Ligand binder design. Structure first.
Ligand code: XG4
Ligand code: MG
Ligand code: MG
Ligand code: NA
Ligand code: NA
Length: 327
DNA sequence: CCGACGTCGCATCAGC
DNA sequence: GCTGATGCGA
DNA sequence: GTCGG
């Protein structure tokens, strides 16, 4: 609809979801709430009763009751109570630091560490990832205008070709879907000498080069196929500095390029129903392959993939442009 | 009544 | 030292 | 928390 049609309900469900994940550490209740928030978020009428909402898939008795209470009062007593709870709301908040999950947040709060100030007082107790998440807390929650995304892409493609002209770098994620803004940058990397059957340092050449031209500023994690770090556009002689941005760089086998491009172009919710159709057509799709499903449900051998739409044709789907892969 | 609820790479911890 | 398990983000 | 075997 418009996100506001049942906004209060979906806001409430989302807040309930976060407390289940971060505080209660009940990941399945977390998803149950988000599943209900999502299906309500697309329901094109103003909900007037919990029973009305209960018609939708993912909405059960407990949520139906909560909707009734919300409609009657404009609030949930449980939600009002946990909001003012110092321990629970502190644990919930600290998980907004990249690197601090439900477990780390609990440990910090248990030993009296509850705010960003407390975190800054206590570098000793943070790991490498958490320090950077702390250092760029504000920046990581800013969004990236597409104009900056294009400027970031310019640098990536240029430096990647410079190291080795036979690389292929493809920016995926929300950018490739043509979104007006993005939360981060995801880059897919491929090279002729790295395929599933079979040069050592392919990912770390590229990382090193982007560090050399001062694009990449920090490293959260780095393996041989997956890089997670921080980047920043260069600013002009007098102009204000750009925010620091999250950037992932992944090295995928060349003969699995399109399955990776599809997978990491998303969106996550597009992917989850694309594999979902696939699981009902006798197919299965991961980030590497599309495999046929045998009579007893067992997956056979990887199929030939030479384009993104090959995957689409396999599974009864008209090809869809990245632009329409919002869900 | 009760088990399922995607999967993955990397960092770090538990334990031998 | 190591392997396996768990946390984390995605 | 919701769904379904
Ligand atoms: N396996 C898996 N993949 C996910 C998940 N979530 C997202 N992706 C897979 C598909 C995601 O689309 C994608 C690329 O990751 P992002 O940058 O995190 N998401 P995007 O670029 O769409 O949004 P944004 O503008 O906020 O950055 O990777 C997930 O929970 N699980
Ligand atoms: Mg992204
Ligand atoms: Mg990303
Ligand atoms: Na329902
Ligand atoms: Na976090």
């Amino acid at each position: 609809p418009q996100e506001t049609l049942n906004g209060g309900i979906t806001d409430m469900l989302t807040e309930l979801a976060n407390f289940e994940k971060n505080v209660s550490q009940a990941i399945h209740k977390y998803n149950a709430y988000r599943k209900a928030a999502s299906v309500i978020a697309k329901y094109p009428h103003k909900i007037k009763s919990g029973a009305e909402a209960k018609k939708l898939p993912g909405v059960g008795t407990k949520i139906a009751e909560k909707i009734d209470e919300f409609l009657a009062t404009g609030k949930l007593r449980k939600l009002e109570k946990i909001r003012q709870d110092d321990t629970s709301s502190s644990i919930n908040f600290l998980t907004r630091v990249s690197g601090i999950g439900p477990s780390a947040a609990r440990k910090f709060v248990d030993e009296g560490i509850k705010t960003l100030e407390d975190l800054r007082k206590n570098e000793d107790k943070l790991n490498h990832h958490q320090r950077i998440g702390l250092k760029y807390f504000g920046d990581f929650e800013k969004r990236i205008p597409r104009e900056e995304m294009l400027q970031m892409q310019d640098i990536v493609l240029n430096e990647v070709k410079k190291v080795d002209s036979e690389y292929i770098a493809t920016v995926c994620g929300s950018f490739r879907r043509g979104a007006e803004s993005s939360g981060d940058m995801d880059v897919l990397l491929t090279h002729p000498s790295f395929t599933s059957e079979s040069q050592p340092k392919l990912l770390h050449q590229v990382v090193e080069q982007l560090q050399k031209v001062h694009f990449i500023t920090d490293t959260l994690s780095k393996g041989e196929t997956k890089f997670m770090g921080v980047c920043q556009l260069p600013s002009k002689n007098d102009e204000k500095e750009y925010p620091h941005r999250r950037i992932d760089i992944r090295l995928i086998p060349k003969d699995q390029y399109y399955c990776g491009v599809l997978y990491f172009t998303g969106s996550d919710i597009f992917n989850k129903n694309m594999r979902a159709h696939a699981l009902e057509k006798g197919f299965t799709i991961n980030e590497y392959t599309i495999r046929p499903l045998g009579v007893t449900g067992v997956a056979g051998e990887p199929l030939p993939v030479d384009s993104e739409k090959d995957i689409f044709d396999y599974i009864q789907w008209k090809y869809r442009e990245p632009k329409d892969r919002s869900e």
